[PDB]
Amino acid sequence: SMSVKKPKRDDSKDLALCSMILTEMETHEDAWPFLLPVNLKLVPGYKKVIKKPMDFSTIREKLSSGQYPNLETFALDVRLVFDNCETFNEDDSDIGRAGHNMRKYFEKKWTDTFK
């Protein structure tokens, strides 16, 4: 509350460390469905169904330009990528399985780097 604060957690390396995680997600062999924005002209249904599209290249641009206020807003966009994927793709598809694998990979790196 006013003039009463928990001890200051060091967040000075968060930007660098989120960039490193994002590099590792970018270079994963199952990243290919997620590298670029879904083409809304060429994929029927995507525009109407997926209210907030997100992809790794869009996260990279947001990260690089100071559009994440803190490390939690960064994790929310990464998770959005996988939540969108599960909304649109059957679990038993190459893309569906890719999304599950990447979400697992992410959540381990996240816990190990920050928890």
XYZ file of N, CA and C in Angstrom:
345
model
N 0.906 -1.213 0.000
C 0.000 0.000 0.000
C 0.911 1.219 0.000
N 0.346 2.435 0.153
C 1.161 3.693 0.210
C 2.327 3.654 1.184
N 3.558 3.816 0.632
C 4.776 3.786 1.445
C 5.083 2.368 2.126
N 4.489 1.333 1.591
C 4.682 -0.072 2.099
C 4.846 -0.996 0.949
N 6.105 -1.404 0.722
C 6.446 -2.211 -0.458
C 7.194 -3.448 -0.131
N 6.800 -4.575 -0.745
C 7.614 -5.812 -0.781
C 9.006 -5.521 -1.308
N 10.000 -6.330 -0.926
C 11.365 -6.144 -1.462
C 11.452 -6.192 -3.031
N 12.323 -5.328 -3.616
C 12.428 -5.161 -5.104
C 13.138 -6.378 -5.792
N 12.345 -7.344 -6.286
C 12.778 -8.341 -7.335
C 13.513 -7.710 -8.564
N 14.699 -8.247 -8.875
C 15.555 -7.676 -9.922
C 14.953 -8.113 -11.272
N 14.380 -7.153 -11.976
C 13.784 -7.386 -13.323
C 14.659 -6.842 -14.467
N 15.900 -6.433 -14.163
C 16.778 -5.747 -15.145
C 17.285 -6.630 -16.336
N 17.295 -7.926 -16.112
C 17.600 -8.930 -17.111
C 16.388 -9.606 -17.811
N 15.195 -9.196 -17.443
C 13.974 -9.857 -17.993
C 13.934 -9.763 -19.545
N 14.247 -8.592 -20.079
C 14.171 -8.336 -21.547
C 15.111 -9.278 -22.290
N 16.360 -9.349 -21.851
C 17.309 -10.268 -22.396
C 16.944 -11.705 -22.264
N 16.452 -12.099 -21.107
C 16.096 -13.457 -20.908
C 14.801 -13.873 -21.735
N 13.807 -12.976 -21.812
C 12.635 -13.278 -22.725
C 13.095 -13.444 -24.206
N 14.063 -12.597 -24.612
C 14.615 -12.680 -25.988
C 15.275 -14.042 -26.217
N 16.006 -14.542 -25.227
C 16.644 -15.826 -25.328
C 15.670 -16.973 -25.424
N 14.641 -16.959 -24.588
C 13.583 -17.939 -24.679
C 12.914 -17.914 -26.094
N 12.609 -16.732 -26.565
C 11.923 -16.544 -27.840
C 12.838 -17.080 -28.951
N 14.182 -16.817 -28.869
C 15.135 -17.426 -29.843
C 15.057 -18.947 -29.847
N 14.954 -19.586 -28.690
C 14.905 -20.991 -28.558
C 13.586 -21.558 -29.142
N 12.508 -20.813 -28.953
C 11.197 -21.227 -29.531
C 11.292 -21.074 -31.108
N 11.873 -19.976 -31.595
C 12.021 -19.710 -33.027
C 12.805 -20.830 -33.768
N 13.776 -21.427 -33.102
C 14.676 -22.394 -33.710
C 14.283 -23.845 -33.461
N 13.237 -24.117 -32.691
C 12.675 -25.441 -32.484
C 12.129 -25.964 -33.816
N 12.393 -27.229 -34.071
C 11.944 -27.802 -35.336
C 10.419 -27.818 -35.539
N 9.616 -27.772 -34.474
C 8.185 -27.703 -34.553
C 7.574 -26.256 -34.520
N 8.399 -25.281 -34.693
C 7.984 -23.891 -34.641
C 7.270 -23.469 -35.933
N 7.460 -24.240 -37.032
C 7.005 -23.768 -38.379
C 5.551 -23.300 -38.493
N 4.570 -23.846 -37.720
C 3.195 -23.249 -37.829
C 3.004 -21.879 -37.238
N 4.039 -21.432 -36.474
C 3.949 -20.282 -35.522
C 4.896 -19.144 -35.894
N 5.723 -19.319 -36.904
C 6.795 -18.348 -37.228
C 6.268 -17.018 -37.756
N 5.171 -17.087 -38.499
C 4.586 -15.939 -39.181
C 3.134 -15.857 -38.918
N 2.516 -14.669 -39.093
C 1.076 -14.583 -38.945
C 0.298 -15.483 -39.953
N -0.771 -16.079 -39.478
C -1.669 -16.910 -40.318
C -2.208 -15.975 -41.402
N -2.205 -16.422 -42.673
C -2.662 -15.536 -43.799
C -4.220 -15.514 -43.809
N -4.766 -14.404 -43.352
C -6.210 -14.262 -43.147
C -6.989 -14.205 -44.442
N -6.315 -13.906 -45.558
C -6.937 -13.995 -46.893
C -7.004 -15.426 -47.375
N -6.059 -16.278 -46.976
C -5.962 -17.613 -47.546
C -6.397 -18.733 -46.653
N -6.838 -18.448 -45.418
C -7.265 -19.532 -44.489
C -8.652 -19.220 -44.055
N -9.617 -19.823 -44.780
C -11.029 -19.673 -44.401
C -11.300 -19.921 -42.941
N -12.092 -19.059 -42.346
C -12.569 -19.224 -40.988
C -11.682 -18.531 -39.952
N -10.410 -18.299 -40.315
C -9.435 -17.841 -39.258
C -9.750 -16.488 -38.722
N -10.046 -15.562 -39.660
C -10.347 -14.179 -39.284
C -11.514 -14.059 -38.320
N -12.615 -14.746 -38.640
C -13.800 -14.681 -37.763
C -13.689 -15.404 -36.438
N -13.039 -16.546 -36.469
C -12.991 -17.369 -35.294
C -11.938 -16.912 -34.287
N -10.790 -16.478 -34.796
C -9.613 -16.227 -33.865
C -9.522 -14.741 -33.633
N -10.001 -14.334 -32.468
C -10.258 -12.912 -32.261
C -8.935 -12.119 -32.087
N -7.917 -12.767 -31.514
C -6.620 -12.120 -31.358
C -5.480 -12.993 -31.917
N -5.200 -12.893 -33.214
C -4.104 -13.695 -33.814
C -2.775 -13.305 -33.194
N -1.892 -14.292 -33.018
C -0.540 -13.996 -32.498
C 0.414 -15.032 -33.069
N 1.666 -14.643 -33.260
C 2.689 -15.510 -33.854
C 4.066 -15.045 -33.334
N 5.109 -15.881 -33.554
C 6.431 -15.571 -32.994
C 7.040 -14.318 -33.574
N 6.842 -14.062 -34.868
C 7.407 -12.845 -35.495
C 6.813 -11.510 -34.952
N 5.533 -11.534 -34.608
C 4.787 -10.466 -34.009
C 5.243 -10.249 -32.563
N 5.430 -11.343 -31.837
C 6.013 -11.225 -30.472
C 7.407 -10.644 -30.560
N 8.224 -11.105 -31.528
C 9.588 -10.585 -31.654
C 9.609 -9.082 -31.918
N 8.735 -8.611 -32.785
C 8.649 -7.194 -33.080
C 8.154 -6.354 -31.846
N 7.160 -6.877 -31.120
C 6.668 -6.237 -29.915
C 7.818 -6.163 -28.853
N 8.553 -7.251 -28.689
C 9.638 -7.340 -27.717
C 10.731 -6.286 -28.031
N 11.151 -6.295 -29.281
C 12.194 -5.409 -29.763
C 11.842 -3.928 -29.724
N 10.599 -3.524 -29.582
C 10.144 -2.148 -29.718
C 9.507 -1.647 -28.411
N 9.786 -2.365 -27.298
C 9.230 -1.959 -25.969
C 7.793 -1.948 -25.780
N 7.080 -2.887 -26.463
C 5.661 -2.990 -26.286
C 5.165 -4.002 -25.210
N 6.103 -4.723 -24.617
C 5.796 -5.495 -23.384
C 6.192 -4.708 -22.088
N 5.172 -4.343 -21.306
C 5.479 -3.641 -20.054
C 6.183 -4.502 -19.053
N 5.961 -5.825 -19.051
C 6.613 -6.651 -18.070
C 6.671 -8.124 -18.614
N 7.381 -8.997 -17.900
C 7.566 -10.381 -18.416
C 6.194 -11.155 -18.479
N 5.188 -10.823 -17.657
C 3.911 -11.506 -17.714
C 3.099 -11.195 -18.991
N 3.204 -9.960 -19.499
C 2.501 -9.649 -20.735
C 3.166 -10.417 -21.870
N 4.465 -10.662 -21.782
C 5.206 -11.449 -22.793
C 4.676 -12.897 -22.769
N 4.561 -13.478 -21.564
C 4.091 -14.911 -21.462
C 2.653 -15.029 -21.979
N 1.823 -14.017 -21.749
C 0.429 -14.061 -22.180
C 0.326 -14.167 -23.738
N 1.144 -13.412 -24.446
C 1.189 -13.523 -25.921
C 1.750 -14.855 -26.395
N 2.784 -15.426 -25.728
C 3.296 -16.715 -26.138
C 2.118 -17.741 -25.985
N 1.478 -17.708 -24.821
C 0.384 -18.691 -24.535
C -0.772 -18.499 -25.532
N -1.095 -17.260 -25.887
C -2.071 -16.939 -26.911
C -1.814 -17.695 -28.197
N -0.538 -17.789 -28.626
C -0.171 -18.495 -29.840
C -0.707 -19.966 -29.699
N -0.451 -20.586 -28.556
C -0.883 -21.982 -28.386
C -2.334 -22.236 -28.135
N -2.990 -21.312 -27.478
C -4.414 -21.299 -27.315
C -5.160 -21.105 -28.588
N -4.677 -20.215 -29.438
C -5.239 -20.088 -30.807
C -5.092 -21.367 -31.580
N -3.911 -21.966 -31.479
C -3.637 -23.197 -32.255
C -4.643 -24.292 -31.830
N -4.830 -24.444 -30.531
C -5.808 -25.470 -30.015
C -7.252 -25.166 -30.401
N -7.602 -23.889 -30.473
C -8.940 -23.479 -30.952
C -9.247 -23.909 -32.430
N -8.264 -23.855 -33.295
C -8.417 -24.065 -34.715
C -7.986 -25.419 -35.273
N -7.167 -26.180 -34.540
C -6.528 -27.372 -35.091
C -6.906 -28.591 -34.225
N -7.206 -29.685 -34.919
C -7.481 -30.901 -34.171
C -6.188 -31.316 -33.409
N -6.347 -31.863 -32.193
C -5.189 -32.485 -31.457
C -4.393 -33.528 -32.290
N -5.105 -34.353 -33.060
C -4.503 -35.345 -33.923
C -4.265 -34.775 -35.355
N -3.383 -33.786 -35.429
C -2.896 -33.189 -36.682
C -1.468 -32.813 -36.434
N -0.704 -32.596 -37.475
C 0.669 -32.207 -37.334
C 0.727 -30.856 -36.590
N -0.168 -29.936 -36.958
C -0.109 -28.581 -36.340
C -0.576 -28.640 -34.894
N -1.615 -29.470 -34.622
C -2.190 -29.622 -33.292
C -1.065 -30.162 -32.366
N -0.353 -31.193 -32.803
C 0.694 -31.792 -32.008
C 1.873 -30.830 -31.825
N 2.191 -30.075 -32.885
C 3.235 -29.064 -32.799
C 2.915 -28.093 -31.683
N 1.679 -27.632 -31.633
C 1.270 -26.670 -30.595
C 1.398 -27.155 -29.175
N 0.984 -28.402 -28.967
C 1.213 -29.000 -27.647
C 2.640 -29.119 -27.309
N 3.523 -29.603 -28.230
C 4.939 -29.741 -27.979
C 5.582 -28.387 -27.609
N 5.232 -27.340 -28.387
C 5.846 -26.021 -28.149
C 5.395 -25.423 -26.834
N 4.174 -25.609 -26.480
C 3.662 -25.105 -25.201
C 4.417 -25.758 -24.022
N 4.508 -27.095 -24.052
C 5.454 -27.783 -23.111
C 6.885 -27.265 -23.052
N 7.573 -27.090 -24.193
C 8.867 -26.591 -24.280
C 8.948 -25.205 -23.615
N 7.982 -24.339 -23.967
C 7.933 -22.973 -23.411
C 7.803 -22.941 -21.866
N 6.895 -23.742 -21.350
C 6.498 -23.664 -19.975
C 7.660 -24.170 -19.094
N 8.416 -25.156 -19.582
C 9.643 -25.559 -18.888
C 10.693 -24.461 -18.847
N 10.999 -23.849 -19.997
C 11.959 -22.759 -20.032
C 11.530 -21.609 -19.128
N 10.234 -21.338 -19.097
C 9.690 -20.237 -18.314
C 9.923 -20.462 -16.786
N 9.507 -21.625 -16.319
C 9.722 -22.082 -14.934
C 11.197 -22.104 -14.567
N 12.045 -22.696 -15.405
C 13.462 -22.754 -15.104
C 14.157 -21.423 -15.118
N 13.730 -20.480 -15.967
C 14.381 -19.189 -16.017
C 13.910 -18.238 -14.885
N 12.644 -18.304 -14.496
C 11.992 -17.272 -13.681
C 11.376 -17.743 -12.329
N 11.029 -19.022 -12.153
C 10.471 -19.550 -10.875
C 11.518 -20.326 -10.042
